[PDB]
From a paper:
Here we report the cryo-EM structure and biochemistry characterization of gp105, a protein that is encoded by the jumbo phage 201φ2-1 and is involved in the formation of the nucleus-like compartment in phage 201φ2-1 infected Pseudomonas chlororaphis. The nucleus-like compartments are assembled mainly by a phage-encoded nucleus-like shell protein (NLSP).
The four molecules at the interface of two head-to-tail tetramers sit on a 2-fold axis, interact with each other through one distal end of the molecule and form a concave tetramer. Given that some of the concave tetramers can have a stable conformation, we performed locally focused classifications and refinements on the concave tetramers with C2 symmetry imposed. Through several rounds of classifications and refinements, we finally obtained a reconstruction of the concave tetramer at a resolution of 4.09 Å. The structure of gp105 is composed of N- and C- two domains. The C-terminal domain (CTD) contains a twisted β sheet core of 7 antiparallel β strands that is sandwiched by 10 α helices. Interactions between molecule A and the two neighboring molecules B and B’ are mediated mainly by loop 303–320 (molecule A), loop 273–287 (molecule B’), the N-terminal segment (residues 49–61, molecule A), and the C-terminal fragment (residues 589–610, molecule B). The C-terminal segment (CTS: residues 589–610) of molecule B is inserted into a groove of the CTD from molecule A. Hydrophobic residues, including F592, M593, V597, V603, A607, and V609, are involved in the interactions between molecule A and the CTS of molecule B. The interaction mediated by the CTS, the loop 303–320, and loop 137–155 are unique and only exist in between the molecules of the concave tetramers. Thus, the concave tetramers play a key role in regulating the size and curvature of the gp105 assemblies.
Residue numbers in the entry:
A (entry chain C): 257 to 303, 320 to 584, 589 to 610
B (entry chain B), C (entry chain E): 49 to 273, 287 to 314, 320 to 582
Write the structure that this text describes.
């Protein structure tokens, strides 16, 4: 609403489609947008594929056509946000686009952390779609974990407080009860059967104290979230003990969070322009892996005919299924 | 809907921003102009909100409201106002590759928005607003307003656009009224002030009435004796016939390239005010004169010490019996050796074609050209064009050739999109990509140039896919700051059409002398 | 029609040539065999003309005509006779490329001809001929007669085929009668004549009952103590997983190939006569024993001084961190270095698959395997296969695993066509093309080998186009004299299925010792 920007490169929009023959309105938008969710992709690392993909939901606001903000719209938007692992749509922003060398977003930075210490010639002609689809299977695990940035003083603060309390605290049980009641008051198909609440938690805080700011370049503003792990790798090149330093300043257990927040601010001033300004503080959390699947199964069984398309040169690259049957171990007959 | 399901006590946004500003500034300009006696206040300017009539783009109309012969007739000129804030839904097409299928989403231009339903809705809106349901509605040629323009800082060009719009409305109303057509006999008089041509070469592009740049390498203009008549601006393009390359790989016991002249601007003189078909054809007759002395080859002549990698003739070295870029920038850049190079690299006869615009400053006249080359309304368009030429000449133009026997022009099934790009200080037209510049940029790499040429021309490819590939290659070259405005269709005139038009003009009176 | 329109006084051609010769020779062989007391004359041989019943290929049937339990039941075994003189119409499919479309015409095999309508027509024909409309019809597995065979010079093989056909008919009739299944407990007795395996390597291919060659590199066989029980013939193939090549271009701080064992022949012993499911599974149990001592890698061991460019391991050099063909034919061809090469080039665990034939000598049994891996009749096939295994074992085989929980085998959506080619003196099976031989023939050229591998396996390509490309690549290599007979589908067993079958056999009694 205000001039503050939010980092968002993947927007999933759900809208109704008129099947009445498309008459008496040629190229007229009318008002069919139900709701949109805006999110980006972050690349974490683990001590298989080392890099693990992560999708952070940032904007959850519904379309301007509707003027009422109710919990059911919020849960509809969260259900919509899952519809991105189909076709590996979360990997689309990592795809290089021809003609632009804006840097701090290229995929070649992963090469600095591979066996060879070199950056892949991403912009060159030898880097084609088939080669890119290799870099992904070879490098990032093909399953995206789902994160979300809860805002204590945001647009949906009165609604984000429920999830923040459900993350764990004195009112954690009451928060779980009320969130279960709210989600069940959307389809009426008995959410208890698909997924309980006492069995396991719904979302866990990762301890990050990521905060919302604003930084200016190129004659426009942009959100401070633009500096993810990949951007830091691109900016600081293949040098070591400074990318891991940045990752540690992002999160470490064996230090007070104030020092790591100061280090993160120093790094933000270092890599990007010093003209950055800070507005508010948020809290990152990770959703349960199967809670989102249960929510999607609920929405499917209640009945929502949702249609996709597109999705991700085409020369054959291996069976990808023969590895299932290895029949390890001989009979060892005496 | 669902907004009224809950009946919340709040209303957000309006859905229309630029239309109000445009209406205010247009009213201010009209009042200022009529205050000091510039335009008669008989005409009126209206507003057409996009939301109130279920239409894609909101376009404001200019109306004259003058009756004729006792029955009401209305002449309206649209003016479309695309807005970047509102993004209308894209157009989806399906392409099947192998067993799989893919969907290509393409943007909607301004040409596709101006459908017949849009015209009918505007006609009924103006009929209801002006209170004459029985009036006859005609159009003077819709013209979009580029989105890059800022409303608060566009005084002079907006005023000139309004003046030209009302002039065009008056001209079409008069043409329906049936005035006296202007034959060439009116030009000739007692004084021996014979006409003349001063063909000139340009580097910076010409500008539209708003500021949109259009590429123009050679201009041909008509003068008396202070007084100017016509100005046709056009550039040169090169194409490769399939047989020439065949005689390079598999020889046998001509030229590897053919020269094409693309007419871009056909506007009349700035000083003159009226715009009529006789003006259009009298100006187009000059588009053939550039072949005198092979003057159309002047842009190919090396520039005065300027590299201009988008116009290097050394690309011809990449496509020849020899190899590598020709080092023309050495001391052997004399005009003579360039003359023998042109004699032995391209054919000495050009081919004429025009990038006809459905939404240009003369879109009403270009529409006739598009209908003359195909579609259902074809023979009637030919009759209209031949009768207009006859009215211009005043003699038996049917004798030179018959329209029913040979076509006036061929469609060729090609789409050229118009835009602009930013380099250095002054922006240039998008149509500077061409083929020679692409070959120079590719600096060899047969595959890349052939792929680009196929992307421009492929009968076996879906038009949307061809447009997408052309856009991608455009973004690849000349930077990634290209901005698109409209779409145009390129059609080539038949040789006999011009070869007879110029001869008929000569027979009916052609007192022009040029030196080269 | 139009032949009867004019009623000419002439009749040309008959439309059937090979059927009469086949009927005559089969009658002669049957009479000769029954004369010296070889076969009981209870069975009868019939004729089925292709023209008289509107069918594609004329096939002659063998019938037993023995009732059961007071109700009539008939057991029939078909025998198809393809003829080169008559060419049935091809099958046309459409593939869309870009905007254009193309039509691919593919030949009709013998598998597609034997449709359900063909079976119904043969059933009603035999019911009408034998005078028992209420009889129940069963099939013992149709088997084609290769077209290259000459009728006048095929005495011994045709007689053996007739004997095997009547034996199969008797076996299926008895199985419907419900005899005592042969459990492993029957084999073991008072004598300590433990079973044994004598796995052996071969170069020349094994032969069918007619003469069709089938590739067989390793054979596993079961002996007593003169007396043989089983003989499973199979070869080795190599496949590349997508992750291995990914760890070659883009490395990270396994093996580049995986070994696949393809079972081709699963026939029982020549000496034994009956053919029952317990025989089939007792023979298939031997298909896992070849992994002992990595014996399945024996064909990959360099040949004794023979180049054999279709089996050179040097192709592994083309696909590796290094380059060029490995010069294994030098003095460093010792078995040890081959051992470390195999340890560091392929994974030490194989994967099992079978080229199941819809029209093989055991086609009736292969049909159950195809239904067990998909289609509508899936769960019933699983119940039948598990109950057959239980009847063989006699114990609780359900304890080892549950069929409803994990699939028995996967279809994998691949088609392998069977044929033969002529080189030197003795012909070999078409299935010798493989992937390693193709890589050796390509002697590098990444693109060619990858294109061939995609032609064999591509989920995104039409099956007819894949078959056509495979045929073209087959004709390109090993000469242009390939002849195709039938089609087979390759399906891979689940690891748990064999890993539990062998263990269950061991628990129920497995007295076999091998040395390697």
């Amino acid at each position: 609403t205000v001039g503050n920007p939010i980092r968002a490169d993947i927007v999933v929009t759900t809208q109704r489609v008129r099947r009445n023959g498309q008459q008496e309105n040629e190229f007229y938008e009318t008002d069919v947008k139900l709701n949109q969710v805006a999110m980006f992709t972050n690349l974490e690392r683990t001590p298989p594929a080392p890099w693990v993909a992560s999708v952070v939901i940032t904007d959850v606001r519904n379309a301007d056509g509707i003027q009422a903000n109710t919990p059911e719209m919020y849960w509809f938007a969260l259900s919509n946000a899952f519809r991105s692992t189909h076709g590996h749509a979360w990997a689309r922003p990592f795809l290089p686009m021809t003609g632009v060398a804006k840097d701090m977003k290229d995929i070649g930075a992963l090469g600095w952390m591979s066996a060879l210490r070199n950056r892949i010639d991403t912009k060159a002609a030898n880097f084609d779609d088939a080669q890119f689809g290799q870099l992904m299977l070879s490098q990032v695990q093909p399953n995206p974990v789902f994160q979300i940035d809860l805002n204590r003083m945001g647009e949906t603060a009165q609604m984000d407080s429920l999830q923040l309390d459900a993350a764990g605290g004195p009112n954690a049980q009451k928060a779980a009860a009320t969130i279960i009641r709210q989600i069940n008051n959307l389809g009426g198909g008995g959410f208890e059967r698909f997924f309980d609440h006492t069995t396991q938690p719904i979302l866990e805080r990762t301890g990050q104290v990521i905060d919302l700011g604003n930084w200016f370049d190129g004659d426009e503003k942009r959100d401070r979230r633009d500096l993810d792990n990949l951007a830091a790798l691109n900016a600081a090149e293949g040098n070591e003990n400074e990318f891991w330093g940045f990752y540690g300043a992002q999160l470490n257990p064996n230090l007070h969070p104030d020092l790591r927040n100061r280090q993160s601010r120093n790094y933000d001033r270092q890599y990007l322009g010093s003209t950055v300004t800070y507005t508010g503080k948020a809290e990152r959390c990770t959703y349960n892996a199967k809670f989102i699947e249960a929510l999607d199964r609920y929405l499917a069984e209640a009945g929502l005919q949702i249609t996709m398309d597109n999705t991700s040169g085409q020369r054959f690259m291996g069976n990808s299924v023969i590895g299932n049957n290895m029949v390890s171990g001989q009979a060892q007959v005496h | 809907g669902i907004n009224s399901q809950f009946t919340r006590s709040g209303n957000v946004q309006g859905g229309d921003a630029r239309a109000s500003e445009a209406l205010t500034v247009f009213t201010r300009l009209k009042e200022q102009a009529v205050a000091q006696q510039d335009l008669a206040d008989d005409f009126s300017i209206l507003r057409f909100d996009r939301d109130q009539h279920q239409v894609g783009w909101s376009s404001l109309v200019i109306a004259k409201q003058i009756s004729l012969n006792g029955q009401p007739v209305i002449a309206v000129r649209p003016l479309i106002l695309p807005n970047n804030s509102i993004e209308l839904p894209k157009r989806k097409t399906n392409i099947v590759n192998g067993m799989q299928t893919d969907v290509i989403e393409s943007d909607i231009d301004v040409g596709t928005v101006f459908s017949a339903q849009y015209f009918n809705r505007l006609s009924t809106y103006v009929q209801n607003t002006l209170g004459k349901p029985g009036a006859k509605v005609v159009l003077a040629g819709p013209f979009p307003i580029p989105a890059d323009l800022v409303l608060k800082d566009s005084e002079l060009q907006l005023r000139n656009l309004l003046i030209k719009s009302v002039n065009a409305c008056d001209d079409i109303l008069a043409l329906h009224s049936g005035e006296r057509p202007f034959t060439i006999a009116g030009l000739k008089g007692q004084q021996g002030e014979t006409l003349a041509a001063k063909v000139d070469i340009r580097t910076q592009p010409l500008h539209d009435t708003v500021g949109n740049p259009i590429r123009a390498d050679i201009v041909v203009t008509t003068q008396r004796v202070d007084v100017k008549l016509n100005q046709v601006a056009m550039f040169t393009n090169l194409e490769r016939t399939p047989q020439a390359q065949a005689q390079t790989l598999f020889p046998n016991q001509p030229a590897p390239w053919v020269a094409s002249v693309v007419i871009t601007d056909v506007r009349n003189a700035d000083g003159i005010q009226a715009n009529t078909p006789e003006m259009y054809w009298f100006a187009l007759s000059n588009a053939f004169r550039s072949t005198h002395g092979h003057a159309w080859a002047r842009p190919f002549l090396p520039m005065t010490g300027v590299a201009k990698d988008m116009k290097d003739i050394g690309a011809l070295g990449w496509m020849s019996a020899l190899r590598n870029r020709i080092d023309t920038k050495a001391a052997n850049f004399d005009d003579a050796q360039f003359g023998q190079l042109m004699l032995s690299q391209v054919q000495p006869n050009p081919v004429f074609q025009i990038d006809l615009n459905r939404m240009g400053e003369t879109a009403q006249m270009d529409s006739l050209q598009l209908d003359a080359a195909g579609g259902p309304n074809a023979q009637k368009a030919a009759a209209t064009i031949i009768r207009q030429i006859n009215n211009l000449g005043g003699g038996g133009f049917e004798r030179f050739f018959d329209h029913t026997t040979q076509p006036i022009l061929e469609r060729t099934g090609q789409v050229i999109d118009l835009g602009n790009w930013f380099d250095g200080d002054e922006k240039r037209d998008r149509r500077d990509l061409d083929n020679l510049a692409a070959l120079n940029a590719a600096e060899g790499n047969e595959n890349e140039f052939w792929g680009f040429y196929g992307a421009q021309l492929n009968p076996n490819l879906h038009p949307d896919l061809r447009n997408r590939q052309s856009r991608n290659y455009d973004r690849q070259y000349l930077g990634s700051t290209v901005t698109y405005t409209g779409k145009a269709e390129r059609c080539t005139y038949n040789a006999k059409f011009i070869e007879a038009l110029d001869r008929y003009l000569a027979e009916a009176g052609l007192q022009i002398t040029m030196d080269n």
